[PDB]
């Protein structure tokens, strides 16, 4: 018929989003000549202030709705004891990080910025560079982590030492506002954004539920649940499906129409599938990292148009580092989403000593490794532990380099054969404090090194977060080693309560990915893989 | 560690891109008051004309470099005979479609538009709506296909009848130019954009070579090779990796720095890996759809920075419908990339009879199917055929609706048991011509219907394009049916030379996805799966 323009996705409000005013500075309304409307001149320093403040706030603060979801776990009669134990560490973590000495997570993430500059906004300068200065500034000032590696070739890399580059996308809109979304996206949650190339034949109730049942297990516990799950069914391209997925997991689309109207847009939020997806998450068994009901806080499902030959599907999560802030600049100043500044009020009234039936088994790590293995071998998987002593810290790059050494005929470093290995990379150490945020790394990315290193007598006791592949279960059964699982997410509580001394041992060029040697007291862990073929997550 | 702004990706030239002028209309330079620089006013009709013209051209024309890669196949002593037979049909196809009666492919694709509106460009109107109108206008005027389905619910859908919505992304840049890239992205090549979530442990020559060998086979022949292959190693997010991959497969990044410089950007184009990837593709055995060397015309490899914990990898293809155009609007007018206006000069001087040594086997389809199955059963896979008679046409939505029928206790439609099945959806029929572009659709998306339908006596002889799953070998072996493969891509040659009558038989609500009944004469096809467990592609 006739031309009726309807956008692919309609414009969306954010009615539950409260903004705090940063300043009425930097902004002036001018009346240009020609046939032009009035314009909003914005000084570039306004962009620097907003991006630095926003990342300051998302690295230390959380949304009230998100904290409220963690607190609801304690009242739920169907939540497991481990669900509640995990949620409480994550609530204590928020209380600690609101003081702004320690960020919530050791991975202060990738800085993602999306701005929408209306045609009536004029900025006399370079937008990306002004936003990058704010990112640079705040990561320099706060006790954050430099996590970005730029390539010097295909295979050689260098940490930039500043957490740049930021990913900045500036879009052209209409009107007299500069709107923004800031995201501090952790790497492990970013690794769990998946694109599934599907077809029309999955687009029926029976097929889609069998599909989603299977695919939702792909996150595992590797992205620190409880999750904010998002699903995008359809899309006009793989890059559009994945962009919308990013937005949906940031809850950017909560106010989108929930029924097609063929008027304001072609894309809608499907409340019915969201409830079905939530139930599958509540029945998946993994719960909040160590068994239970709270795989997911909540779910977002967005249905887009598609080419007849296509049905791209996106699934992804926001992790327990749920870090995003809306912002905007208009003729009334610089505005930033208000996050929760009194997170202590979401802490439940209870003694943590009363949440868990059995007390932790205490393991002295400052023993000969055969002794430590002997003590661990007395306990079945699911056994909660409390660890005290020296630990060697190494993750992706240090493991990659040791594999090169082995392949060159060089021995595995001896410190790998004498201590447990904790996969982690610390954020910067605050003045006068024993440790920066120092939580655990995804254990599955190190699975290709386990059999290799244990065949050299190393990596016999591993401490990290997330479930692992069956090859690690077989390797530990083959050589008699252990995978100890930690709670992922509460890096500030660990830095404050458990990590007593931090030294850089080896591979110092790798920044945060260097080999560290740390002293811990009462570090919490569960036995996840034992020396007999048993895996926590294969049982239930 | 001083602040040194370096973009994620540098700005890129397009030095091999010649632009033709459409008009000096619609643009005026004005000098506004205040402290504002001179501005360029662009009438919204300029965006309508540019988008209308760009899509007119990409649907009918190709880049000269692309035609030359096809023509280079004929002088290559290592090109297979089928490589050349395929290349020749695609060269004839380009010659036909340059008349603008028939588009190169029946799938005129998803309309993708990316714009860069400079700070000094003002459009007194709605850019997105003006670009969609040009898309609307040209799909109405030319004999294109309406391919877009908007949801009425999660599972109910409707074709829009216009090929809207377009995917429009407008970025805010600086300066006095409005730059564009227009892409008509086929559904089948878009389905072969894959996101692989990898880690640092793949980032070594041996692992990355093992990884790429395995993953490059994922395209198969389902996206109508020879491909323009693109690979992106790294990226700051999944949506960025997939965005950059789209551009790289459009050859947008051809002028990118080929070595890191730590100044203009952090991303570079890796010529040494492009050379390794091309060799893997030349040795992969699938060739240009039916065995040979020309799986790939060429290769692009982009290396991006990454979070320490992440290595997203994108792989994708431009299909035989390699459809993109750069454009721009400035103070000197409306510009559009010049595509090849005389493709006939790229046809080799050779008789098509001289290319293949064994003649095609002629199969009369106007017989009882047991006769046709007996005739086809005389021949092994790879046997070239030439088919004449009646064929039923049905693909995705029509199969899904017949699967609904069977589960309800409704019989498989009788026409499915009486004729060969052609998976295809036609573009609009030109006035006074027997058929619109009417090439084949990807056969693998119908694999879930094969065993089901043959168990009801239907779909015994299938005609489509691309390799299929092992469950189709077993179903044809179980029930005694055949999958005959055709060359994908040259939909205009088929409409001109092979398709003699077209009728809509059933399911007319589904538009191009309705069930059709066509008469073909000398339609070429190869036996790809027979009634004995043999697969063309399981034997190289
Ligand atoms: O880099 C880290 O510290 C942890 C990352 S965010 C992860 O694996 O989830
Ligand atoms: O939709 C079509 O006509 C064919 C698509 S592009 C495909 O399967 O390749
Ligand atoms: S909460 Fe877990 S997944 Fe998220 S950034 Fe922190 S360690 Fe990574
Ligand atoms: S050339 Fe093949 S893959 Fe590309 S749009 Fe046409 S039918 Fe689809």
Curated annotation (Swiss-Prot), chains A, B:
Activity control note: Specifically and competitively inhibited by 2-thiomalate, which coordinates with the catalytic [4Fe-4S] cluster.
Residues bound to (S)-malate 1: 106-107, 145, 188, 395, 441-445, 465
Cofactor needs: [4Fe-4S] cluster
Keywords: 4Fe-4S, Iron, Iron-sulfur, Lyase, Metal-binding, Mitochondrion, Transit peptide, Tricarboxylic acid cycle
GO cellular component, one term: cytosol
EC number(s) per entry: 4.2.1.2
Organism domain of life: Eukaryota
InterPro entries the UniProt entry points to: Class-I_Fumarase/Tartrate_DH, Fe-S_hydro-lyase_TtdA-typ_cat, Fe-S_hydro-lyase_TtdB-typ_cat, Fe-S_hydroAse_TtdB_cat_sf, Fe_dep_fumarate_hydratase, Fumarate_lyase_CS
Binding positions ([4Fe-4S] cluster): 105, 224, 319
Top-level EC class: lyase
UniProt pathway annotation: Carbohydrate metabolism; tricarboxylic acid cycle; (S)-malate from fumarate: step 1/1
Binding sites annotated in the UniProt record for (S)-malate 2: 191-197
Cofactor note: Binds 1 [4Fe-4S] cluster per subunit.
Alphabetized Pfam families for the sequence: Fumerase, Fumerase_C
Biological process (GO), any one: tricarboxylic acid cycle
Main location, first listed in the record: mitochondrion
Subunit structure, interactors included: Homodimer.
PANTHER family, alphabetized: FUMARATE HYDRATASE CLASS I, AEROBIC, FUMARATE HYDRATASE-RELATED
Function: Catalyzes the reversible hydration of fumarate to (S)-malate. Catalyzes the hydration of fumarate to L-malate in the tricarboxylic acid (TCA) cycle to facilitate a transition step in the production of energy in the form of NADH.
Protein name, as recorded: Fumarate hydratase 1, mitochondrial
Organism: Leishmania major
Taxonomy of the source species: Eukaryota, Discoba, Euglenozoa, Kinetoplastea, Metakinetoplastina
